[PDB]
Write a protein that binds this ligand. Structure first.
Ligand SMILES: [Zn+2]
Lengths: 97, 76, 116, 58, 58, 209
RNA sequence: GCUG
DNA sequence: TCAGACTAGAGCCGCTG
DNA sequence: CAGCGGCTCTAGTCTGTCCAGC
């Protein structure tokens, strides 16, 4: 939330982001701007590249290609605002190796 | 062996960070720590004695790679 | 005290013509404008003019920057053969990533183009 | 506004293990960083790595 | 200027203080210079565009 | 005038000699180094010194590779060049079996003539130069470094030393004036020798694209 | 609207 | 509020046939 | 004598304008 009245918390702006890049601090930038804000998991079907739910893909009517991806929630939100605009972000996922 | 002998600042930060997380998760400590209750302090002591069980794999832009042991790299 | 010689300062925007009038030493005339220098002398002279002009402006206000920073900025603006700005238009010619482009300016248009 | 623009454009550049500066796509911006390979934060002199008169006296 | 002889024989020994230099000092000088050069190189991984961006912006 | 007009026909010819010497065509040092008074001896006033046929140069020959390889430098009298002037130039080139020519136009070239130079033939390549560009040898300008056109056996070492592909090198346009001067084409690499602030040098490379 |  | 560097149009004249 | 075509020119329009707090 936004501030002191609402026990809101503090903002890591676009300028503080530019500072941390210049230190090469890749994991701290991941901790601050993902883990301690909006960490989430989505089911992604590797066949159609769309998001699914509960390990089920309604588009394919199958259960075998679905996988879990660690994603910021604001990006999941973006990936559902864009589909309603009919801009489809079809993902492709490799293994983490 | 073309890559710099000296360990980079970025390499030291990650090696200490992974080692501290490993020590904080009950890994064996090779430094006989004396009165240390903080994983990051224990990890830094290990680096000074050059006894950290981690190998740094340096990937060249083309895709070729060279592996340097933490002990082999000079620490400044 | 050692010498007295007259240089000619031209407030205008045709470098090629001033390089070609009888009695101007064309090998040693310069311009502020990177677009004129690019059109007349090519990308590598334009690259040096970005270095010279940023460093001139910094020194006048008493700032100092190591030359390696203004060097990298100029190499970034000229590596594709044309002097590309740090504007949204230059960044769209340098950067391939949709989400990088959509996270700066024109956030709607880049996302519909990637869909098309 | 200027700072936002410059950073968005230059954020990607990284100095590589083969002593080159490359974009994220793998194109070359510079074959060696700054011509010398040297770090601005380490300059004991005016843009130069050492000052020999001072070092010999030390 | 002072008529010093390189064999070290000249009687007012204080003359050898004027521009003194010893082999040990030459050895330590060359090692200090060579070390300071190697440690002044821009280390691989450095986010060198973000330093460039902020150094012109500030 | 007449003093000023001959001055151009000397400086342009001198620059054309310098361009031919840089491009590897064989020009004698007497042609390369001339004086306006020596030029006056061959021709003096604007009437006697005629731009259209008097100064035309087919002397240049690529001694390094082909004695037959030859270049015609043509200065058209008309300020804007039509295809008709280009067609007369092409017929002269077709008979001699020469494949390269330079056309030195005085003010410009008409659009339909410019289109012809793209498509007349890949085996008959002609380069437009404005004379206002040739009054100053840009390879001797203080802001322009030394450019050196690299051999294929050296490009294959550049790409091996860094483990690059060609399309990761920096680019230079063929429209670039230094690219026109050396007459380089797409897929050639130029070495560029930038001067340092110190006595040293920095070497960089660009790809024509 | 003001503080930063 | 203040550009600002894109995107079509309206031509224009003159060779281009 | 007529028709492309690029130039050239209006001008039209959409696009920005620091970080944050209360
Ligand atoms: Zn599916």
């Amino acid at each position: 939330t936004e501030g002191r009245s609402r026990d809101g918390g503090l903002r890591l702006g676009e300028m503080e982001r530019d500072c941390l890049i210049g230190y090469g601090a890749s994991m701290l930038l991941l901790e601050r701007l993902m883990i301690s804000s909006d960490a989430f998991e989505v089911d992604v079907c590797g066949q159609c590249g769309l998001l699914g739910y509960s390990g089920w893909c309604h588009y394919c009517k199958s259960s075998c290609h679905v996988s879990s991806l660690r994603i910021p929630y604001a990006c999941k939100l973006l990936f559902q605002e864009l589909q309603s605009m009919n801009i489809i972000p079809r993902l492709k996922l490799s293994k983490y190796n | 062996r073309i890559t710099t002998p000296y360990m980079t600042k970025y390499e030291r930060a990650r090696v200490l960070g992974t080692r501290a997380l490993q020590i904080a998760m009950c890994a064996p400590v090779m430094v006989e720590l004396e009165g240390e209750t903080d994983p990051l302090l224990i990890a830094m002591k290990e680096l000074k004695a050059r006894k950290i069980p981690i190998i740094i794999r340096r990937y060249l832009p083309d895709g070729s790679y060279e592996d340097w042991g933490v002990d082999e790299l000079i620490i400044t | 005290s050692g010498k007295e010689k007259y240089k000619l300062l031209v407030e205008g925007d045709n470098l090629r013509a001033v390089m070609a009038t009888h009695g101007v030493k064309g090998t040693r005339t310069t311009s502020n404008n990177t677009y004129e220098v690019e059109k007349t002398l090519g990308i590598e002279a334009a690259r040096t003019t970005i270095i010279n002009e940023i460093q001139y402006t910094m020194v006048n206000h008493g700032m100092s920057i190591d030359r390696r920073h203004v060097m990298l900025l100029s190499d970034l603006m000229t590596y594709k053969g044309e002097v590309l700005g740090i504007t949204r238009f230059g960044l769209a010619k340098m950067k391939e990533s949709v989400l990088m482009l959509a996270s700066f300016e024109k956030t709607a248009d880049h996302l519909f183009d990637a869909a098309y | 506004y200027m700072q936002r623009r410059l950073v968005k454009s230059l954020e990607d550049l990284c100095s590589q293990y083969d002593l080159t500066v490359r974009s994220s796509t793998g194109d070359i911006i510079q074959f060696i960083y700054g011509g010398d390979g040297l770090d601005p934060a380490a300059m004991e002199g005016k843009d130069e790595p050492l000052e020999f008169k001072r070092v010999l006296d030390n | 200027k002072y008529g010093i002889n390189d064999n070290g024989t000249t009687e007012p020994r204080v003359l050898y203080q004027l521009d003194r230099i010893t082999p040990t000092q030459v050895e330590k000088f060359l090692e200090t210079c060579r070390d300071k050069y190697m440690r002044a190189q821009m280390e691989p991984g450095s986010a060198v565009g973000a330093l460039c961006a902020q150094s012109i912006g500030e | 005038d007449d003093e000023e007009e001959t001055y151009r026909l000397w400086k342009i010819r001198k620059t054309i000699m310098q361009l031919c010497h840089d491009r590897g065509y064989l020009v004698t040092q007497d042609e390369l180094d001339q004086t306006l008074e020596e030029f006056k001896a061959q021709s003096g006033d604007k009437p006697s010194e005629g731009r259209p046929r008097r100064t035309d140069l087919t002397v240049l020959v690529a001694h390094n590779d082909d004695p037959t390889d030859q270049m015609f430098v043509f200065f058209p009298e008309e300020p804007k060049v039509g295809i008709k002037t280009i067609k007369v130039y092409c017929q002269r080139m077709q008979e001699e079996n020469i494949t390269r020519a330079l056309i030195v136009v005085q003010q410009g070239m008409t659009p339909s003539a410019k289109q012809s130079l793209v498509d007349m033939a890949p085996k008959y390549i002609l380069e437009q130069f404005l004379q206002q560009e040739l009054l100053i040898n840009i390879t001797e300008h203080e802001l322009v470094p030394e450019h050196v056109v690299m051999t294929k056996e050296e490009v294959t070492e550049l790409l091996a030393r860094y483990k690059l592909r060609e399309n990761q090198l920096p680019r230079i346009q063929a429209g670039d004036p230094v690219a026109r001067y050396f007459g380089i084409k797409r897929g050639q690499v130029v070495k560029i020798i930038r001067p340092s602030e110190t006595a040293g040098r920095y070497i960089t490379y660009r790809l024509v694209q």
